[PDB]
């Protein structure tokens, strides 16, 4: 008996739901994943005067959370094109911006940077109610966040450390009880369970900053990208412990990490190429694909089935087809481009960039919705010295 | 020796654009850089502060070769930079102990100090360009 | 295969920059100490010009080669300050090491140094007033010429050269 992969069987079985198999979902989404990118339309939103958007996640079918350089957390309602802000939470003591946002596997806890860039703030979903006080576990700014479990989260920092925070059954039970009983939410006080540093390899030990984190739910692995040119793999099934390290083909601008669950491949960005890493392969056996946007840098990366979406400093998004081992062509590589958004002609611009009136809005974050047909794109000007924002929904 | 003497005087006579360097102009520039480090919320703010501190190597070295304590000697000039803007009162280089530049006769051309900073920063950029083949923008984080 | 990891790769540049800055920092200002050198022909010369000592010494490092141009560009256009430019460049590198310990990317620290230099240069237009009296300015010019010759090249401070 041969394996049936045709969508025809899916369609006729779906009409009856008579033990319809889930094995057809891979073909359903992959087929659309190849055709969707060329049919998307741009829906730009006005973000006001927010500095930049660095991270975003889908919270509902209508809203996407976005983090900013000014530590302001907000949600873009793509269904009504409205902007709603979220209060910034303070730390336990009065002792940059939000570079990463992640959702727990249960989609009940939102982890973002707090008022202090070195502190993690926890928000409740879908209500956006505060969950916990900003921590002080890190001695420097937090650049990466990843949820390793429904109760545990790991956050990186400029010094290469990764804080391990765990919510116990008692803390979670009381937190949930308070939010459902009391109309006014009450946040709990938290501290990090442990603090561990990435392994010190023969590469630059000083440039050990962890810029991106990604969690593999299937193998319970926590991947980490450092700017020293090495990738680090840690176990995060129950406790935080190092597993392996591999060498990247490029050691510049390694700022984004994504994991392909259907391919067991870690995608690491660089100044120009996306690295394809396999923990089962030798540390030197890493493939690289050039985004063709040389000199601008890769700012974001994500997997949509077998299609890898790559965001660059020119404000464009490239699509790479793993099965075809090539970039998708437009119906000439197919690419989406960001709009003008909002640029701040402030004193810093006047002092350093006065010779250029407009800069393209780099793609700092993007994310696909649960259906895979809506792609949220957000960012801002590529230069670190400029302020400005962009966001839009591609559909 | 005559070339340096004749260049300083030639520019000061042709135009009145003078800089009282040796610790006064350097500390003032350090403040202007530090102010931007606080105004800019970005990752480079610490690097800019480092630049502001590096500007003090000059008064430090001038007092380091002398018998004076360079730390205590620069203390007064730094405090004056807070008290008043654009001071012309730096450390002495004649070992007189009087923190001035108009009585210590330490004068340089305004364009001269600009050239010193411009050249020094170029050296830094060239040596901290480690292995990037294509010239990048100042990419964000 | 020998690899220089992190600060080790930059340490080569730091040490070379200090190797020169150690002599430049003692030559700054009218109280600077002169550098005496004997050439390959047995010719003794006395200079306090950073460009001269960098060109006369045997270059064995990339920094020592680049520093020659760093000081040469100063005396060709301005004159004095050939030793100050080197000291400042070395100080920027010396602080760069600390920035690396902060975990700041090597390129990002370079970017910050350029931005700070632009502001430090422009701020000089406001530093130091543009009103100079001919009589009051004559005196520091005489003292400057006397220290320029008498502390840098010629130990007898020729009266004719400094006054003329």
XYZ file of C-alpha atoms in Angstrom:
700
model
C 0.000 0.000 0.000
C 1.518 3.328 -1.124
C 1.419 6.495 0.970
C -1.258 8.952 -0.176
C 0.068 12.523 -0.130
C -2.382 14.059 -2.610
C -4.567 16.961 -1.495
C -7.496 15.334 -3.346
C -7.827 12.694 -0.626
C -7.614 15.445 1.987
C -10.471 17.380 0.392
C -12.807 14.394 0.140
C -11.983 13.175 3.662
C -12.293 16.656 5.183
C -15.900 16.898 3.978
C -16.797 13.915 6.174
C -14.138 14.164 8.915
C -14.202 10.363 9.027
C -10.838 9.911 10.712
C -9.304 12.418 8.313
C -5.536 12.136 8.587
C -3.324 15.027 9.677
C -0.532 13.846 7.374
C -2.062 15.998 4.624
C -1.382 19.237 6.523
C 2.261 19.221 5.405
C 1.267 19.236 1.723
C -1.596 21.689 2.256
C 0.643 24.288 3.869
C 3.697 23.612 1.690
C 1.707 23.972 -1.521
C 0.317 27.290 -0.350
C 3.705 28.339 1.044
C 5.147 28.339 -2.467
C 2.282 30.320 -4.070
C 1.340 32.709 -1.242
C 4.464 34.950 -1.207
C 3.826 36.308 -4.712
C 0.129 37.095 -4.127
C 0.453 39.151 -0.928
C -0.739 42.763 -0.747
C 0.796 45.427 1.502
C -1.181 46.950 4.393
C 0.924 49.666 6.032
C 0.077 50.954 9.511
C 0.927 54.253 11.199
C 2.875 53.612 14.402
C 3.139 57.239 15.508
C 6.433 58.390 17.039
C 7.756 55.014 18.256
C 11.528 54.696 17.843
C 11.754 51.332 16.013
C 10.152 47.875 16.079
C 12.589 45.036 16.776
C 10.365 42.054 17.634
C 6.809 40.907 17.031
C 4.567 37.907 17.684
C 1.021 36.904 16.770
C -1.220 37.117 19.833
C -4.581 36.715 18.113
C -6.054 36.541 14.625
C -6.473 40.329 14.747
C -3.474 41.621 16.736
C 0.328 41.311 16.678
C 2.510 42.379 19.618
C 5.486 44.624 18.823
C 8.481 45.661 20.913
C 10.335 48.942 20.468
C 13.712 50.611 20.990
C 12.071 52.947 23.538
C 10.891 49.964 25.652
C 7.271 50.662 24.688
C 5.276 47.469 24.132
C 2.204 47.621 21.900
C -0.117 45.530 19.724
C -1.094 46.261 16.111
C -4.716 45.342 15.390
C -4.365 44.277 11.755
C -8.103 43.591 11.467
C -9.083 47.173 12.344
C -5.732 48.887 11.618
C -5.594 50.293 15.160
C -2.622 50.788 17.507
C -3.013 49.900 21.204
C -0.180 50.459 23.687
C 0.670 48.301 26.717
C 1.947 49.811 30.010
C 5.686 49.403 30.599
C 6.399 47.383 33.749
C 9.005 48.494 36.296
C 11.592 46.384 38.120
C 11.645 45.403 41.793
C 14.252 48.123 42.464
C 15.041 51.433 40.671
C 18.383 50.254 39.311
C 18.721 49.351 24.121
C 14.962 48.715 24.030
C 13.122 45.457 23.382
C 15.158 43.362 20.932
C 13.161 40.112 21.212
C 9.645 38.888 22.002
C 8.528 35.272 22.420
C 5.355 33.367 23.343
C 5.279 30.291 25.580
C 4.239 26.984 23.938
C 0.809 27.346 25.582
C 0.301 30.921 24.281
C -0.596 32.119 27.787
C 2.498 34.129 28.816
C 4.144 36.965 26.867
C 7.827 37.667 27.589
C 9.182 41.106 26.628
C 11.793 43.568 27.831
C 10.780 45.814 30.720
C 11.338 49.471 31.562
C 14.948 48.551 32.273
C 16.502 46.843 29.209
C 18.281 44.379 31.513
C 14.992 43.141 33.017
C 12.370 40.734 31.686
C 8.700 41.737 31.914
C 5.861 39.193 31.742
C 2.401 39.985 30.361
C -0.776 37.891 30.428
C -2.477 36.790 27.228
C -4.965 37.464 25.688
C -5.833 40.229 28.184
C -2.355 41.849 28.213
C -2.573 42.034 32.014
C 0.749 42.280 33.898
C 2.005 38.957 35.265
C 5.303 39.658 37.040
C 7.721 42.385 38.116
C 10.800 43.152 36.045
C 13.768 41.082 37.230
C 17.355 42.149 37.947
C 19.076 38.854 37.147
C 21.137 40.227 34.259
C 23.883 42.807 34.709
C 23.454 44.110 31.138
C 20.810 44.641 28.463
C 18.699 41.681 27.337
C 18.934 41.105 23.582
C 17.193 37.725 23.233
C 14.234 35.875 24.764
C 13.042 32.295 24.229
C 10.374 30.219 26.000
C 11.732 26.722 26.674
C 8.532 25.497 28.377
C 5.093 26.687 29.458
C 6.583 27.887 32.769
C 10.285 28.440 31.973
C 11.921 31.149 29.858
C 15.570 31.903 29.046
C 16.868 35.394 28.243
C 20.289 36.322 26.856
C 22.442 39.401 27.315
C 25.389 41.420 26.025
C 27.776 39.690 28.449
C 26.935 36.263 27.019
C 24.965 35.108 30.047
C 21.554 33.449 29.849
C 19.146 33.765 32.762
C 16.888 30.814 33.578
C 13.508 31.844 35.021
C 10.986 29.247 36.203
C 7.363 29.680 37.302
C 6.377 27.056 39.876
C 2.953 25.402 40.021
C 2.048 27.482 43.091
C 3.060 30.805 41.508
C 1.202 30.072 38.269
C -1.891 28.826 40.117
C -2.123 31.927 42.308
C -1.374 34.262 39.383
C -4.147 32.719 37.261
C -6.571 32.645 40.201
C -6.040 36.355 40.866
C -6.530 37.365 37.233
C -9.765 35.396 36.794
C -11.273 36.346 40.170
C -10.172 39.982 40.481
C -11.051 42.326 37.616
C -7.920 44.330 38.494
C -4.816 42.208 37.735
C -2.107 41.631 40.354
C 1.490 40.861 39.335
C 3.842 38.536 41.230
C 7.473 39.155 42.213
C 10.071 36.960 40.470
C 13.813 36.248 40.358
C 15.943 34.068 38.081
C 16.432 30.429 39.076
C 19.996 30.206 37.737
C 22.389 32.147 35.510
C 24.651 30.299 33.060
C 27.111 31.544 30.446
C 27.558 30.241 26.914
C 30.614 27.970 26.539
C 33.948 29.674 25.886
C 35.320 28.411 22.565
C 38.486 29.162 20.595
C 36.641 32.092 18.984
C 36.429 35.623 20.402
C 35.557 35.178 24.103
C 34.804 38.892 24.512
C 32.185 39.155 21.746
C 30.144 36.496 23.527
C 26.856 38.416 23.408
C 23.801 36.256 22.723
C 21.720 38.120 20.152
C 19.113 35.486 19.265
C 17.524 32.433 20.872
C 15.247 29.741 19.447
C 13.637 26.705 21.088
C 13.005 23.336 19.420
C 9.788 21.973 20.918
C 10.328 18.515 19.400
C 13.789 17.871 20.878
C 13.536 20.402 23.748
C 16.674 22.199 22.555
C 17.558 25.861 23.075
C 19.692 27.247 20.264
C 21.696 30.440 20.650
C 23.534 32.680 18.188
C 26.539 34.660 19.381
C 28.367 37.402 17.509
C 31.706 35.602 17.862
C 30.754 33.496 14.840
C 29.760 30.362 16.761
C 26.386 28.743 17.337
C 25.655 27.188 20.722
C 23.140 24.435 21.473
C 21.833 23.955 25.016
C 19.404 21.449 26.489
C 16.282 23.037 27.977
C 13.984 20.068 28.629
C 14.138 20.369 32.435
C 17.363 22.261 33.221
C 19.756 24.500 31.279
C 22.911 22.648 30.167
C 25.267 22.894 27.181
C 25.088 20.268 24.418
C 27.164 21.306 21.398
C 28.754 24.180 19.497
C 29.255 24.604 15.749
C 31.186 27.061 13.597
C 29.384 29.569 11.402
C 30.728 30.375 7.921
C 30.458 34.081 8.778
C 31.105 35.906 12.049
C 29.518 39.270 11.176
C 25.996 40.507 11.930
C 24.802 37.123 13.236
C 21.732 38.724 14.784
C 18.809 36.440 13.910
C 18.015 32.797 14.593
C 15.125 30.592 13.513
C 14.472 26.858 13.680
C 12.806 24.731 11.019
C 10.818 22.086 12.875
C 10.117 20.092 9.690
C 13.786 20.050 8.670
C 15.709 20.052 11.982
C 17.790 22.961 10.664
C 18.873 26.077 12.539
C 18.956 29.207 10.376
C 21.538 31.798 11.451
C 21.715 35.194 9.791
C 24.875 37.051 8.854
C 26.121 40.116 6.996
C 24.962 38.528 3.728
C 24.349 34.770 3.994
C 21.931 32.549 5.921
C 23.681 29.590 7.541
C 21.969 26.188 7.692
C 23.139 24.327 10.798
C 22.645 20.674 11.733
C 23.618 19.566 15.273
C 24.040 16.019 13.925
C 26.748 17.122 11.469
C 30.399 18.095 11.995
C 30.987 21.607 13.310
C 32.372 22.692 9.920
C 29.550 21.202 7.812
C 27.363 24.307 7.630
C 25.774 25.448 4.378
C 25.332 29.105 3.446
C 22.888 30.787 1.058
C 23.497 34.363 -0.046
C 20.568 36.755 0.345
C 22.211 38.900 -2.386
C 21.809 41.950 -0.102
C 25.530 42.292 0.581
C 26.676 45.006 2.979
C 23.254 45.627 4.549
C 23.012 42.604 6.867
C 20.326 40.036 7.634
C 18.116 41.265 10.471
C 15.437 38.563 10.785
C 14.809 34.967 9.700
C 11.878 32.571 10.041
C 10.555 29.260 8.705
C 7.181 28.850 6.978
C 7.049 25.106 6.195
C 9.981 24.547 3.786
C 10.212 28.255 2.831
C 12.695 30.415 4.765
C 11.842 34.128 5.017
C 14.915 36.383 5.331
C 14.679 40.045 6.378
C 17.473 42.452 5.413
C 18.678 45.973 6.187
C 17.397 47.254 2.837
C 13.843 46.699 4.058
C 13.217 43.633 1.894
C 12.212 40.033 2.624
C 13.633 37.124 0.607
C 12.104 33.643 0.341
C 14.299 30.531 0.112
C 12.851 27.166 -0.975
C 14.542 24.318 0.920
C 13.115 21.590 -1.322
C 14.218 23.374 -4.492
C 17.426 24.660 -2.849
C 16.877 28.074 -4.445
C 15.159 31.403 -3.869
C 11.580 31.735 -5.088
C 11.189 33.694 -8.322
C 8.569 36.364 -8.945
C 5.700 35.466 -11.283
C 14.508 37.870 -10.459
C 14.188 36.699 -6.853
C 10.772 37.322 -5.298
C 10.913 39.840 -2.445
C 8.586 41.991 -0.338
C 9.495 45.612 0.446
C 8.587 47.839 3.400
C 6.947 51.255 3.138
C 8.057 54.694 4.272
C 6.642 54.352 7.787
C 7.874 57.262 9.899
C 11.371 58.767 10.078
C 12.510 61.076 12.893
C 14.649 63.951 11.566
C 16.022 64.557 15.058
C 19.309 66.084 16.240
C 21.189 62.785 15.903
C 20.136 62.488 12.261
C 21.167 66.106 11.699
C 24.583 65.447 13.235
C 25.473 62.222 11.425
C 23.077 61.594 8.517
C 22.162 65.100 7.337
C 23.139 64.229 3.748
C 20.310 61.674 3.379
C 16.654 62.638 3.767
C 15.162 59.130 3.671
C 16.400 55.694 4.677
C 14.741 52.367 3.798
C 12.964 50.711 6.713
C 14.949 47.587 7.583
C 13.031 44.399 8.408
C 13.822 43.815 12.074
C 10.975 41.403 12.771
C 8.349 39.416 10.904
C 6.025 36.569 11.784
C 3.457 34.319 10.124
C -0.009 33.815 11.558
C -1.448 30.428 12.517
C -2.891 29.998 9.024
C 0.408 30.911 7.380
C -1.250 33.328 4.941
C -0.704 36.594 6.860
C 2.886 37.829 7.220
C 3.411 40.717 9.644
C 6.471 42.851 8.845
C 7.882 45.566 11.090
C 11.092 47.482 11.588
C 12.714 50.843 11.002
C 15.707 52.579 9.431
C 18.820 50.432 9.201
C 21.275 52.941 10.782
C 21.659 52.574 14.539
C 21.917 56.361 14.886
C 18.476 57.058 13.394
C 14.982 56.766 14.868
C 11.993 55.673 12.803
C 9.439 52.890 12.467
C 7.534 50.762 9.990
C 4.881 48.079 10.222
C 2.451 46.418 7.863
C 0.463 43.260 7.276
C 1.029 41.308 4.066
C -1.983 39.289 2.932
C 61.010 73.566 14.666
C 60.603 76.732 12.629
C 57.920 75.039 10.492
C 55.713 74.401 13.517
C 56.336 77.858 14.998
C 55.632 79.583 11.669
C 52.493 77.544 10.950
C 50.847 78.292 14.300
C 51.572 82.007 14.071
C 50.640 82.193 10.371
C 47.147 80.879 11.024
C 46.652 82.975 14.172
C 47.630 86.194 12.380
C 45.606 85.489 9.243
C 42.524 84.658 11.324
C 41.692 84.783 15.030
C 40.544 81.137 15.163
C 42.541 79.731 18.083
C 42.143 76.702 20.346
C 43.550 76.525 23.885
C 44.433 72.845 23.836
C 46.339 70.754 26.331
C 43.398 69.843 28.554
C 40.899 72.672 28.119
C 39.639 72.037 24.587
C 39.908 68.265 25.076
C 37.725 68.190 28.199
C 35.159 70.436 26.512
C 34.950 68.076 23.525
C 34.658 65.142 25.937
C 31.549 66.704 27.455
C 29.967 67.271 24.039
C 30.466 63.572 23.235
C 29.216 62.327 26.620
C 26.050 64.406 26.255
C 25.253 62.550 23.029
C 25.912 59.227 24.750
C 23.115 60.089 27.184
C 20.792 61.503 24.509
C 21.203 58.457 22.252
C 19.487 55.351 23.702
C 21.469 53.069 21.356
C 24.237 50.465 21.729
C 26.991 52.855 20.569
C 26.424 55.157 23.570
C 29.126 53.354 25.552
C 31.611 53.597 22.681
C 31.006 57.341 22.482
C 31.671 57.645 26.216
C 34.944 55.798 25.637
C 35.867 58.442 23.065
C 35.134 61.207 25.574
C 37.490 59.545 28.055
C 40.175 59.028 25.411
C 40.274 62.782 24.801
C 41.730 63.139 28.317
C 44.857 61.142 27.422
C 46.480 64.431 26.348
C 46.261 66.371 29.653
C 46.989 63.084 31.406
C 50.190 62.530 29.422
C 51.189 66.184 29.837
C 50.971 65.802 33.612
C 52.313 62.239 33.548
C 55.685 63.350 32.224
C 55.772 66.076 34.884
C 56.189 65.581 38.611
C 52.542 66.480 39.164
C 49.901 63.865 39.885
C 47.940 63.616 36.605
C 44.766 62.419 38.355
C 44.665 65.242 40.903
C 45.797 67.733 38.251
C 43.007 66.821 35.833
C 40.475 66.907 38.691
C 40.335 70.730 38.693
C 39.965 71.031 34.912
C 37.211 68.402 34.811
C 35.353 70.170 37.623
C 35.688 73.451 35.720
C 34.259 71.824 32.593
C 31.116 71.172 34.614
C 31.065 74.654 36.160
C 31.491 76.515 32.860
C 31.174 75.685 29.173
C 33.969 76.024 26.607
C 36.733 76.735 29.159
C 40.127 78.056 28.118
C 41.587 76.992 31.486
C 43.367 73.652 31.257
C 46.418 72.166 32.978
C 49.771 73.928 32.881
C 52.636 72.546 30.795
C 55.364 74.754 32.281
C 55.082 73.035 35.689
C 53.874 76.241 37.321
C 50.792 74.681 38.906
C 48.431 77.358 37.555
C 45.560 75.860 35.557
C 45.480 78.185 32.567
C 46.375 78.393 28.893
C 46.640 82.180 28.457
C 49.312 82.528 31.159
C 51.034 79.221 30.365
C 51.354 80.303 26.701
C 50.034 76.971 25.385
C 48.211 77.917 22.179
C 47.438 75.927 19.031
C 45.505 76.624 15.844
C 41.796 75.784 15.862
C 42.099 73.848 12.598
C 45.080 72.052 14.126
C 43.063 70.474 16.928
C 40.312 69.572 14.460
C 42.894 67.807 12.283
C 44.321 65.891 15.248
C 40.926 64.441 16.196
C 39.916 63.731 12.583
C 43.138 61.816 11.886
C 43.088 59.858 15.160
C 39.545 58.601 14.611
C 40.426 57.463 11.086
C 43.176 55.275 12.563
C 40.652 53.657 14.913
C 38.160 52.855 12.153
C 40.834 51.233 9.986
C 42.161 48.930 12.713
C 38.730 47.933 14.096
C 37.571 46.909 10.581
C 38.435 43.302 11.366
C 37.311 41.202 8.356
C 34.358 42.954 6.597
C 35.181 42.950 2.847
C 32.181 45.001 1.636
C 31.829 48.452 3.275
C 28.654 48.335 5.449
C 26.299 50.920 6.837
C 26.185 51.499 10.590
C 23.824 48.551 10.937
C 21.387 48.472 13.846
C 21.456 45.762 16.515
C 47.579 26.508 13.290
C 47.845 29.478 15.668
C 44.652 31.505 16.133
C 44.299 34.788 18.032
C 40.961 34.710 19.871
C 39.200 37.991 20.656
C 41.299 40.502 22.534
C 44.362 38.506 21.464
C 43.770 39.467 17.834
C 43.418 43.098 18.850
C 46.241 42.897 21.406
C 48.765 43.009 18.574
C 47.385 46.425 17.609
C 47.041 47.550 21.236
C 50.648 46.726 22.115
C 51.984 48.392 18.968
C 49.899 51.502 19.676
C 51.247 51.566 23.226
C 54.799 51.001 21.980
C 54.578 54.308 20.134
C 52.291 56.110 22.591
C 54.814 55.432 25.359
C 57.227 57.731 23.529
C 54.614 60.177 22.259
C 53.071 60.777 25.696
C 56.431 61.995 27.032
C 56.905 64.475 24.161
C 53.643 66.429 24.380
C 53.631 70.163 25.003
C 56.450 72.607 25.754
C 57.612 70.277 28.551
C 57.962 67.324 26.189
C 61.143 65.271 26.303
C 63.152 65.119 23.084
C 64.001 61.800 21.426
C 67.655 61.258 20.505
C 68.401 58.725 17.773
C 71.518 57.406 16.039
C 71.079 56.577 12.367
C 72.524 53.616 10.470
C 75.370 55.908 9.347
C 76.233 56.843 12.929
C 74.469 60.210 12.644
C 72.929 61.453 15.896
C 69.815 63.618 15.601
C 67.518 65.158 18.216
C 63.827 65.489 17.403
C 60.518 65.766 19.213
C 58.447 65.252 16.062
C 56.390 62.065 16.117
C 56.669 61.771 12.334
C 60.476 61.812 12.424
C 60.859 59.118 15.088
C 58.248 56.892 13.452
C 59.966 57.170 10.071
C 63.500 56.784 11.445
C 62.774 53.709 13.568
C 62.687 50.324 11.849
C 59.032 49.483 11.201
C 58.100 45.924 12.180
C 54.338 46.206 12.738
C 51.272 47.304 10.780
C 50.457 49.966 13.382
C 53.993 51.358 13.267
C 53.626 51.615 9.484
C 50.218 53.334 9.685
C 51.337 55.732 12.436
C 53.927 57.225 10.074
C 51.131 58.506 7.842
C 49.071 59.504 10.882
C 51.750 61.974 12.024
C 52.879 62.934 8.514
C 49.401 64.226 7.675
C 49.629 66.476 10.741
C 52.892 68.242 10.001
C 52.164 68.575 6.267
C 49.000 70.611 6.875
C 49.194 71.919 10.450
C 52.737 71.461 11.707
C 52.632 70.806 15.444
C 50.625 68.000 17.007
C 52.427 65.122 15.285
C 52.831 63.415 18.665
C 49.353 64.306 19.933
C 47.520 62.578 17.082
C 49.274 59.291 17.866
C 48.559 59.523 21.598
C 44.875 60.173 20.929
C 44.620 57.276 18.462
C 46.294 54.971 20.973
C 43.947 56.104 23.739
C 40.900 55.374 21.583
C 42.224 51.854 20.958
C 43.140 51.340 24.624
C 39.564 52.183 25.622
C 38.246 49.986 22.795
C 39.585 46.977 24.699
C 37.291 47.849 27.631
C 34.351 48.208 25.258
C 34.999 44.661 24.037
C 34.876 43.428 27.629
C 31.431 45.011 27.851
C 30.430 42.604 25.077
C 29.956 45.407 22.553
C 30.566 44.206 19.001
C 33.993 45.239 17.598
C 32.326 47.020 14.675
C 29.788 48.823 16.878
C 32.576 50.268 19.029
C 34.330 51.462 15.868
C 31.063 53.120 14.790
C 30.762 54.900 18.132
C 34.311 56.249 17.893
C 33.620 57.812 14.500
C 30.367 59.409 15.708
C 32.078 60.835 18.784
C 34.928 62.195 16.663
C 32.518 64.088 14.411
C 30.965 65.846 17.402
C 34.324 66.477 19.096
C 35.652 68.090 15.910
C 32.652 70.348 15.336
C 32.516 71.398 19.000
C 35.951 73.001 18.531
C 34.338 75.842 16.563
C 32.728 77.091 19.779
C 35.698 76.346 22.056
C 38.076 79.298 22.550
C 37.084 82.890 21.739
C 37.973 84.580 18.443
C 39.071 87.909 19.994
C 42.861 88.272 20.204
C 44.850 91.414 21.052
C 48.037 91.908 19.017
C 50.088 92.858 22.087
C 48.746 90.095 24.325
C 49.151 87.515 21.550
C 52.771 88.470 20.807
C 53.997 87.124 24.170
C 52.683 83.518 23.967
C 53.950 83.386 20.378
C 57.473 84.207 21.581
C 57.262 81.628 24.371
C 55.854 79.061 21.931
C 58.725 79.544 19.488
C 61.253 79.292 22.328
C 59.789 76.027 23.629
C 59.224 74.682 20.105
C 62.909 74.979 19.263
C 64.538 74.839 22.706
C 62.765 71.734 24.042
C 62.451 69.675 20.851
C 65.540 69.890 18.622
C 68.148 72.353 19.907
C 69.036 72.310 23.608
C 70.461 75.864 23.545
C 67.203 77.529 22.379
C 68.641 79.816 19.681
C 67.530 83.367 20.433
C 67.544 84.382 16.766
C 65.379 81.487 15.576
C 62.740 81.851 18.302
C 62.545 85.648 18.052
C 62.771 86.006 14.270
